Design a protein around this ligand. Structure first.
Ligand SMILES: CCCCCCCCCCCCCCCCCC(=O)OC[C@H](COP(=O)([O-])OCC(O)COP(=O)([O-])OC[C@@H](COC(=O)CCCCCCCCCCCCCCCCC)OC(=O)CCCCCCCCCCCCCCCCC)OC(=O)CCCCCCCCCCCCCCCCC
Ligand SMILES: CCCCCCCCCCCCCCCCCC(=O)OC[C@H](COP(=O)([O-])OCC(O)COP(=O)([O-])OC[C@@H](COC(=O)CCCCCCCCCCCCCCCCC)OC(=O)CCCCCCCCCCCCCCCCC)OC(=O)CCCCCCCCCCCCCCCCC
Ligand SMILES: CCCCCCCCCCCCCCCCCC(=O)OC[C@H](COP(=O)([O-])OCC[N+](C)(C)C)OC(=O)CCCCCCCCCCCCCCCCC
Ligand SMILES: CCCCCCCCCCCCCCCCCC(=O)OC[C@H](COP(=O)([O-])OCC[N+](C)(C)C)OC(=O)CCCCCCCCCCCCCCCCC
Ligand SMILES: CCCCCCCCCCCCCCCCCC(=O)OC[C@H](COP(=O)([O-])OCC[N+](C)(C)C)OC(=O)CCCCCCCCCCCCCCCCC
Ligand SMILES: CCCCCCCCCCCCCCCCCC(=O)OC[C@H](COP(=O)([O-])OCC[N+](C)(C)C)OC(=O)CCCCCCCCCCCCCCCCC
Ligand SMILES: CCCCCCCCCCCCCCCCCC(=O)OC[C@H](COP(=O)([O-])OCC[N+](C)(C)C)OC(=O)CCCCCCCCCCCCCCCCC
Ligand SMILES: CCCCCCCCCCCCCCCCCC(=O)OC[C@H](COP(=O)([O-])OCC[N+](C)(C)C)OC(=O)CCCCCCCCCCCCCCCCC
Ligand SMILES: CCCCCCCCCCCCCCCCCC(=O)OC[C@H](COP(=O)([O-])OCC[N+](C)(C)C)OC(=O)CCCCCCCCCCCCCCCCC
Ligand SMILES: CCCCCCCCCCCCCCCCCC(=O)OC[C@H](COP(=O)([O-])OCC[N+](C)(C)C)OC(=O)CCCCCCCCCCCCCCCCC
Lengths: 187, 99, 50, 318, 49, 66, 50, 101, 59, 209, 35, 41, 115
């Protein structure tokens, strides 16, 4: 299925994370499929927040000792030297954010989870997406998924938070009453 | 005032979930219309406080006021005549309770 | 006082304009369900003119 | 429109070369006097520019023609340098057509009803025209100098009496063969602009008028008018700069306004005359280009239709 | 209390008009509805301003 | 001045759009104009009630209110 | 291909209208030979008398 | 008798332009449901977008690439200077922590 | 703008006289009916794309 | 070796040149392979998302890239570059205004406290100016990366919005309905292609949950 | 107001009324006359 | 000077901007009855 | 029009607010969820295939539709060569899309049933 377009081929990282969280909270996805995704998300966050700290000493040892770096350091104000260092560090950090192997692994794990959801609920996986609120990011959705996992697997899974097992009544949708009418408004 | 106005506007938008782009375009047009309608009057008020408000200007403004009210009264009177002469079904068999 | 009169005028105007939307509840016995229905209005033309 | 072409028959390289050479020969023979008048008007307006107002803004091609004819040389005076002009035009056409046909054959689409986009066709045509103009620049230089001799003062004239004589004089007197490529860059730019600003508007208007009025016969000629007008509008400044560079005499004292290059000539033109100065003799240039294109298209279409009918193509394919 | 609380409850929290709304009118009795009038939402700027 | 300039630029551009579209671009109404609307929330959501430029990416619906 | 300007030939599809008349249809008699002959005859006859 | 009157009404001209725009757009949307596709003639929309910045750019002569480049360099230096000044006193706080101890 | 008093000077030379200018736009003015009708019918293809086309019977 | 008439027709359908056109999407070179996978059972998948409006989002633009691609209608490299020029001018103006309001690094000033703006407003004003500059810089970076991506996709890879290209090719009432090209019209589309496209079927869900 | 300064900024409060490239406000951004 | 042509172009730009302002003032923002009547015609 | 149709997804609206039976709803059988199927427009007799695709050619590929910010009207806009040049052939489906002249004669002018 290399040439087959998956249902979420156009979804962003935020949309994919929101879909995963929605499936988990609605219990379409069980808690036994999360741990790999959670570990990948934590590793990605650690790498993203630690990259500049490891990179700047490397730039000091290798790049900032280059000919052009020494020229800038010795021939321009210290403020301009600091600006150049900050600019190069920021560019490297952006490149890392874009092409991190850890980020790629996290995206691959999200793809695997989405494939599992597609197999489980057919094409209805598209129903898990909505108009995500602005400024809510994939990291935030992953944090929410981790929080829900902790709440469900913690000591307060039935005292302070809802349990993971579903106790929905067993009825027939084709005959059970519905809360909404197709066209009119009910009383 | 800003708190109350913004809260009321947002609540009234939310209760009916209006289309944002179309409604904001319409409200921008309305805002420009009202702002430029009132800007002329603000300019007149600011300009006539010194060396501009003469007897001719005062008479002109009185005449404009009375003319505007007369123009509105014309349409109101046309509608009042229509109300007074409002048509109805024949009184014999179609509508006997009109009496 | 002008704000009070404005509120009264707006309330009356809203009632008058909402008259023309005739909304009623109809009870479907087969489904045992009340449904909201909208319909036009018929009245004396003097009321519309006023 | 990407599949509206009908390239069901394509001429061979020899046929293309021969037909193009003959048709361009007769077209140049017919339309040479207009180019002569345009060049003379540009030379006489160089350094001064248009100074009339409103309807009189410009130089009258009829006035220039009458002044040239009054010299007593008759119509033979308008064909001075025609040998050089024809040789240069033939060399340019040969090189450009060969390069364009080779590239088009190499990169043509497989389907007969599909043709290269106008962008790619313009790129290829511009490259071929620039190469040909660079190769055959000296002939144009000699022809333009011969034309401008009459306008310029006798002491400033070069006195060439043939293409070979002019080439030899330029090579010897000015020193080195490098002097034969004066104005080559301007000629290349003019050729590129002319190649790219002709085939686009023609197809544009031809298709639009076909859509409007359906399949008629005047559509081709209306599109030709539109394309010729827009090509003149796009190309005339470069032709004027090329003419100025060619007319620039070797000795700085001889030149009324010496130039060091294309940019220098453009700056001097802008300084000494408004931006409109690039469009002196626009009517003559438009008439020349339109007549040349019309005769070439007519003859080529007739011959190609005859060849297609002999081959056996259907009426709609032709 | 007068301009925001009471109008809000009388307009949105009930479809039943008050007496003074229609005592002078001659229409038959009917209820209100906030979601079947002024589709252009021209009342939002008015109330806000 | 910011408000004044915004208003003037918007007015000029919209007026130019109106004139050009009503005088030259009436041949292909489908290509020149987009169809949209929004109805009262009491009635079911209209088919044309959607965010323009995103109809290929989202479908909008709402719950009726009394 | 033959020179700087290219006369691009394009094919089109069938189109027809309700009415096939009152437009432009070339008469069979409208030809170079026949039109020229008639014009020359008329012009010469008129010019001789004039 | 009448005092001097202004000889131009720019706000009035623009108010009339807005009135025309409102009339046309509102009527088409309400009764035809048609909204002009501004993207068809994308260059007028881009003209509006450009005019939203063109005068301010012209004031400082930002049509010159050299001016733009030097302005970007100066702005980046200003931003970095502000950040460094804000975050510098952390070192002094750490140093005086020793005195406090 | 904010440097000149709003007044009319005594000198009559301040009168705004009309002086004829470029004449090119008047060519388009004279050709306007042709241009306007062409835009109305040919450019907008009104009432349809076949009315103005040369008539051909169906195959 | 060559098969029967049916096999020859299938080979022609799978031929790269049977559907591809010079001015059309290159994907038509393997459209049949793509169609067989994306049109299983003859059904077109609806990739749209069903959204119940709740005012959680207004502009509906997921990100600045989507805003430029859809709201600004910049679907071509020239439009992207024009928007980039506008953004560059805006960023330069924003930086100049920030430097003017806070004369830090100019006139020899080396401290924020040496500014009348800080005197009048102080740390909150400095924070506001910093936030404004950062916001404009962020938007400039987003539009620049969008323009670079558009340039790479179009100028280098020759990728284009093929629906827009078809719109350009057909200016309206054009008679380009040719039987030779199946894609020109619905009628001219090959009958066997319709059957071949719906050859495969979907897979039933597991319902494992 | 392009390459030619006609109005006097010393007698104006804001120079942004008309497009130009040769005018600068006397009271620039960040300047606050305070007693 | 090395930018005489550039100076001429700057003069042209100034002339065009001044003409734009003059046209806007005299035919768009004007309240003159004769000009309004001509535009009406 | 089917893209504009909203009743197709009306079933999901109830579960967007009532999650209690959302899993049971998902456990149903998928027939036409998030899919469009156009009935045959031409008579085809091919025993080899039991189903045929009649999706619009312009709507065939989503890879170009996803990033195109336009409505799905290009697919329906003048994509068929078939035409009927007859006067009796109606050009407007709605016979009430007319005008009552400049006199505004009622009830023709003032009733939507006619104008
Ligand atoms: C303010 C402006 C704003 C924008 C608007 C612009 C308006 C412009 C006009 C008004 C203003 C004034 C001008 C300003 C120009 C500014 C730019 C500039 O620098 O251009 C100068 C530039 C050059 O002008 P120049 O400096 O005067 O020099 C030209 C001279 O004429 C050269 O002299 P020549 O003609 O006598 O040439 C002799 C010839 C002598 O010949 C030689 O080259 C000698 C050495 C090689 C010899 C061998 C040749 C090959 C044969 C042998 C091969 C090997 C053997 C093979 C086997 C054996 C058989 C052969 O030399 C050449 O070939 C050319 C010179 C370079 C030679 C050195 C080597 C080059 C190598 C690379 C090229 C190689 C290929 C060349 C040929 C083409 C391909 C076929 O001209 C232009 O760029 C033209 C104008 C601009 C065009 C682009 C459009 C820009 C505007 C776009 C629209 C904008 C609208 C919106 C507004 C934007 C506002 C910003
Ligand atoms: C020892 C044990 C320690 C244990 C640990 C705990 C204890 C230790 C201390 C813990 C401290 C925790 C601190 C938490 C806050 C900070 C971190 C945080 O939350 O980050 C936000 C953010 C949260 O995102 P996320 O949830 O992780 O999602 C990431 C996902 O991968 C995908 O997400 P995405 O990337 O798509 O989304 C990006 C962004 C979406 O983009 C945006 O929305 C950003 C829009 C532009 C904002 C511009 C703000 C101005 C400052 C910019 C940054 C500094 C200047 C950079 C200059 C660069 C050029 C040199 O999303 C957001 O973050 C949305 C936030 C929106 C709220 C903004 C708040 C207001 C800002 C304005 C304030 C001033 C005005 C208002 C004042 C009001 C006062 C009442 O973190 C990041 O992901 C950022 C990653 C790194 C990017 C670096 C980019 C280049 C700049 C850095 C290099 C140059 C530095 C130069 C200065 C150096 C000296 C200072
Ligand atoms: C209690 C003692 C501590 C100090 C108290 C301080 C007094 C506070 C007074 C608040 C006045 C609020 C004015 C609101 C105006 C808008 C009203 C409106 O829109 O109507 C909504 C509502 C009415 O909504 P409604 O639609 O239900 O109207 C009911 C209509 N009738 C009466 C026929 C049944 O307003 C009211 O309920 C009353 C409004 C009265 C407005 C009177 C205006 C002039 C006088 C103002 C009070 C002056 C008091 C001065 C201090 C005296 C101290 C002794
Ligand atoms: C073997 C015996 C059997 C008969 C053999 C044939 C007899 C000899 C025929 C000689 C050639 C005759 C035609 C010459 C050209 C036209 C007449 C003439 O004098 O022109 C010379 C004119 C010159 O005229 P001129 O004006 O310079 O004459 C001298 C002028 N004064 C007295 C002031 C000095 O042209 C040239 O000689 C130069 C250009 C020639 C090449 C370009 C020709 C372009 C036009 C070609 C198309 C047809 C033109 C004719 C159209 C009208 C007739 C159909
Ligand atoms: C600030 C100033 C900066 C100046 C320098 C940097 C910027 C340079 C910008 C250059 C722009 C070039 C644009 C080319 C013209 C495209 C116009 C266009 O799209 O028109 C629509 C049409 C598009 O046609 P189409 O193929 O899409 O189809 C048209 C038909 N319909 C509408 C139905 C689809 O393109 C043309 O007609 C272009 C024809 C000309 C193409 C060739 C251009 C010149 C190429 C030169 C190559 C090199 C020559 C040798 C050089 C030797 C020395 C190095
Ligand atoms: C149907 C609609 C679509 C139409 C498409 C078809 C083409 C449309 C073409 C429209 C443009 C027409 C231009 C006409 C040109 C003039 C013709 C004429 O005869 O007039 C000559 C006159 C004078 O030309 P002249 O200067 O050469 O005069 C010569 C003077 N003597 C004789 C003394 C030597 O031209 C002008 O006065 C100027 C004309 C151009 C005006 C340009 C206006 C826009 C400028 C924008 C600049 C933006 C700069 C931004 C960068 C930053 C700046 C600080
Ligand atoms: C507007 C946005 C663009 C950027 C900002 C503006 C900068 C550019 C401003 C240019 C203004 C116009 C300059 C030329 C003025 C010519 C005036 C004139 O007619 O002079 C009398 C000349 C006189 O020519 P004549 O010598 O043949 O005279 C014939 C008339 N009698 C016989 C009476 C003397 O008339 C013409 O040539 C008429 C046609 C003029 C066409 C001018 C086209 C200018 C195009 C320049 C750019 C190149 C084309 C690009 C677009 C098309 C191709 C893609
Ligand atoms: C305009 C003034 C100056 C000029 C004077 C002359 C103008 C004369 C205009 C009328 C001429 C005659 C024609 C009459 C047409 C009537 C049309 C009509 O009824 O439309 C009404 C329309 C309703 O039309 P509709 O079409 O929606 O009607 C619904 C009916 N059905 C369902 C059948 C379609 O309403 C509006 O236009 C909205 C008005 C909103 C007013 C909001 C007032 C707010 C007051 C706030 C203060 C009070 C206290 C609360 C404060 C709270 C603060 C938080
Ligand atoms: C009298 C003609 C000259 C007028 C000069 C002054 C006005 C400016 C020019 C206006 C346009 C002139 C007509 C030709 C171009 C029409 C382009 C167009 O949009 O038509 C498409 C239209 C239909 O195009 P379409 O229907 O395919 O699509 C148009 C665009 N959309 C998709 C938005 C609808 O075609 C026509 O109306 C047919 C026009 C036939 C004209 C034949 C005579 C003129 C041809 C020779 C001209 C030679 C000189 C050069 C032109 C004048 C000087 C610059
Ligand atoms: C009648 C009213 C008329 C109103 C007209 C205005 C309508 C709205 C126009 C919006 C245009 C801007 C782009 C819209 C599309 C956004 C797309 C997007 O994702 O965002 C792009 C960008 C963000 O880039 P992004 O695209 O990377 O962000 C999305 C990506 N994730 C999910 C990872 C975050 O945001 C913006 O364009 C807007 C940023 C904020 C602008 C603020 C301006 C004013 C300054 C602050 C004032 C003080 C506020 C105080 C708040 C206090 C809170 C407690």
């Amino acid at each position: 299925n290399n040439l087959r377009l998956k249902p979420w081929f156009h979804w962003t990282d935020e949309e994919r994370s929101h879909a995963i969280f929605s499936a988990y909270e609605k219990r379409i996805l069980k808690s036994e499929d999360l741990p790999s995704f959670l570990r990948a998300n934590r590793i990605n966050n650690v790498s993203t927040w630690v990259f500049p700290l490891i990179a700047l000493p490397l730039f000091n040892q290798s790049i900032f000792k280059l000919g052009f770096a020494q020229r800038i350091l010795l021939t321009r104000p210290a403020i301009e030297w600091h600006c150049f260092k900050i600019a190069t560090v920021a560019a490297s950090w952006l490149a890392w954010l874009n092409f991190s192997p850890f980020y790629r692994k996290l995206e691959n794990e999200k793809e695997y989870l989405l494939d599992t959801l597609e197999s489980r609920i057919g094409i209805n996986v598209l129903d898990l997406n909505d108009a995500l609120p602005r400024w809510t990011t994939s990291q935030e959705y992953n944090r929410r998924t981790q929080q829900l996992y902790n709440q469900r697997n913690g000591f307060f899974a039935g005292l302070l938070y809802p349990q993971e097992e579903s106790s929905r009544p067993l009825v027939d949708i084709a005959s059970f009453p519905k809360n909404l009418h197709k066209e009119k408004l009910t009383k | 005032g800003l708190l109350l106005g913004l809260s009321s506007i947002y609540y009234l938008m939310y209760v009916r979930l209006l289309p944002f782009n179309k409604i904001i375009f319409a409200w921008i047009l309305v805002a420009m219309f009202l702002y430029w309608l009132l800007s002329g009057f603000v300019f007149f008020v600011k300009k006539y406080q010194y060396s501009k408000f003469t007897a001719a200007i005062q008479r002109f403004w009185k005449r404009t006021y009375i003319i505007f009210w007369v123009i509105e009264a014309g349409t109101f009177s046309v509608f009042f005549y229509l109300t007074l002469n409002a048509s109805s079904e024949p009184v014999y068999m179609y509508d006997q309770i009109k009496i | 006082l002008l704000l009070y009169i404005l509120w009264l005028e707006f309330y009356q105007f809203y009632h008058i304009l909402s008259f023309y939307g005739n909304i009623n509840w109809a009870f479907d016995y087969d489904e045992y369900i009340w449904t909201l229905e909208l319909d036009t209005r018929r009245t004396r033309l003097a009321n519309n003119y006023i | 429109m990407n599949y509206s072409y009908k390239r069901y028959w394509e001429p061979s390289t020899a046929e293309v070369i021969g037909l193009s050479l003959s048709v361009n020969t007769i077209s140049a023979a017919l339309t040479y006097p207009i180019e002569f008048v345009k060049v003379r008007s540009q030379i006489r307006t160089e350094g001064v520019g248009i100074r009339s107002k409103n309807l009189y803004m410009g130089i009258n091609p009829n006035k220039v023609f009458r002044e040239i004819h009054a010299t007593g040389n008759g119509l033979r005076g308008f064909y001075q340098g025609f040998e050089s002009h024809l040789i240069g035009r033939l060399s340019y056409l040969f090189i450009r057509n060969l390069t364009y046909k080779i590239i088009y054959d190499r990169t043509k689409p497989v389907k007969a009803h599909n043709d290269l986009s106008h962008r790619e066709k313009g790129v290829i045509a511009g490259f071929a025209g620039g190469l040909a103009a660079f190769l055959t620049s000296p002939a144009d230089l000699v022809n333009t100098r011969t034309i401008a001799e009459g306008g310029k003062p006798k002491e400033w004239r070069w006195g060439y009496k043939g293409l070979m004589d002019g080439i030899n004089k330029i090579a010897a007197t000015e020193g080195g063969n490098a002097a034969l490529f004066r104005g080559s860059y301007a000629n290349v730019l003019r050729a590129v602009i002319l190649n790219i600003s002709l085939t686009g508007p023609f197809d544009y208007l031809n298709e639009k008028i076909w859509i409007t009025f359906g399949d008629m016969t005047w559509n081709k000629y209306a599109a030709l008018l539109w394309a010729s007008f827009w090509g003149s509008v796009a190309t005339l400044p470069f032709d004027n700069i090329r003419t100025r560079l060619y007319a620039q005499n070797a000795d700085p004292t001889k030149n009324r306004l010496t130039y060091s290059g294309w940019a220098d000539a453009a700056k001097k033109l802008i300084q000494h005359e408004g931006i409109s100065g690039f469009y002196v003799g626009f009517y003559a240039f438009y008439i020349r280009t339109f007549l040349y294109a019309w005769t070439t298209v007519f003859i080529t279409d007739k011959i190609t239709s005859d060849w297609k009918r002999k081959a056996g193509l259907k009426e709609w394919q032709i | 209390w007068c301009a925001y609380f009471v109008p809000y409850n009388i307009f949105f929290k009930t479809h039943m008009p008050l007496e003074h709304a229609y005592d002078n009118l001659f229409f038959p009795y009917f209820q209100h509805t906030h979601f079947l009038w002024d589709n252009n939402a021209l009342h939002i700027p008015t109330v806000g301003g | 001045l910011s408000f004044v300039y915004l208003s003037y630029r918007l007015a000029w551009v919209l007026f130019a759009y109106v004139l050009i579209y009503n005088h030259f671009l009436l041949g292909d109404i489908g290509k020149t104009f987009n169809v949209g609307e929004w109805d009262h929330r009491l009635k079911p959501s209209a088919e044309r009630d959607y965010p323009t430029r995103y109809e290929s990416l989202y479908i909008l619906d709402r719950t009726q209110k009394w | 291909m033959f020179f700087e300007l290219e006369d691009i030939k394009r094919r089109h599809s069938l189109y027809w209208d309700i009415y096939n008349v009152q437009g432009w249809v070339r008469r069979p008699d409208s030809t170079l030979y026949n039109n020229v002959k008639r014009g020359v005859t008329a012009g010469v006859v008129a010019s001789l008398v004039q | 008798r009448y005092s001097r009157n202004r000889q131009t009404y720019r706000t009035g001209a623009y108010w009339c332009l807005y009135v025309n725009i409102i009339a046309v757009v509102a009527f088409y949307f309400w009764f035809y449901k048609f909204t002009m596709n501004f993207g068809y003639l994308w260059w007028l929309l881009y003209s509006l977008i450009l005019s939203f910045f063109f005068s301010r750019a012209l004031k400082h002569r930002f049509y010159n690439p050299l001016n733009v480049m030097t302005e970007f360099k100066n702005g980046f230096m200003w931003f970095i200077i502000i950040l460094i000044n804000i975050f510098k006193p952390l070192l002094k706080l750490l140093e005086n922590n020793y005195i406090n101890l | 703008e904010s440097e000149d008093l709003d007044f009319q000077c005594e000198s009559f030379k301040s009168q705004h006289f009309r002086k004829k200018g470029p004449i090119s736009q008047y060519l388009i003015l004279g050709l306007l009916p042709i241009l306007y009708f062409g835009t109305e019918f040919f450019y907008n293809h009104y009432p349809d794309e076949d009315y103005w086309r040369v008539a051909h019977p169906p195959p | 070796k060559k098969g029967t008439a049916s096999e020859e027709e299938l080979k022609k359908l799978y031929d790269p040149n049977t559907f591809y056109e010079h001015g059309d999407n290159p994907a038509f070179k393997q459209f049949m392979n793509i169609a067989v996978e994306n049109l299983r059972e003859g059904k077109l998948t609806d990739h749209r998302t069903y959204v119940v409006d709740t005012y959680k989002k207004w502009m509906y633009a997921r990100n600045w890239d989507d805003f430029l691609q859809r709201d600004c209608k910049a679907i071509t490299f020239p439009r992207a570059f024009a928007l980039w020029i506008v953004g560059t001018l805006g960023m330069a103006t924003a930086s100049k205004w920030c430097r003017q309001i806070l004369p830090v690094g100019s006139h020899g000033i080396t401290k924020i406290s040496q500014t009348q703006f800080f005197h009048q407003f102080g740390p909150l004003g400095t924070l506001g100016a910093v936030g404004f500059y950062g916001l404009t810089a962020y938007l400039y970076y987003k539009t620049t990366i969008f323009t670079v991506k558009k340039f790479y996709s179009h100028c280098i890879l020759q990728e284009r919005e093929w629906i827009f290209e078809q719109e350009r090719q057909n200016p309206g009432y054009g008679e380009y309905f040719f039987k030779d090209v199946p894609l020109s019209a619905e009628e001219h589309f090959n009958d066997l292609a319709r059957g071949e496209m719906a050859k495969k079927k979907f897979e039933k869900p597991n319902h494992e949950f | 107001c392009i390459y030619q300064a006609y109005q006097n900024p010393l007698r104006h409060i804001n120079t942004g009324h008309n497009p130009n490239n040769v005018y600068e406000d006397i009271v620039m951004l960040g300047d606050y006359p305070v007693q | 000077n090395y930018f005489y042509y550039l100076d001429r172009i700057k003069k042209l730009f100034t002339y065009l901007n001044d003409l734009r302002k003059h046209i806007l003032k005299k035919y768009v923002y004007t309240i003159n009855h004769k000009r309004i009547a001509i535009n009406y015609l | 029009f089917p893209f504009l149709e909203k009743m197709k997804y009306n079933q999901y609206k109830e579960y967007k607010n009532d999650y209690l039976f959302y899993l049971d709803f998902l456990k149903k059988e998928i027939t036409d969820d998030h899919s469009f199927f156009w009935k045959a427009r031409k008579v085809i007799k091919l025993p080899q295939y039991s189903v045929f695709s009649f999706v619009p050619l312009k709507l065939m590929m989503w890879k170009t539709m996803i990033n195109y910010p336009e409505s799905f009207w290009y697919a329906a806009s003048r994509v068929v060569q078939s035409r009927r040049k007859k006067v009796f052939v109606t050009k407007c489906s709605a016979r009430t899309l007319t005008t009552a002249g400049w006199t505004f004669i009622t009830p023709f002018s003032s009733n939507i049933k006619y104008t």
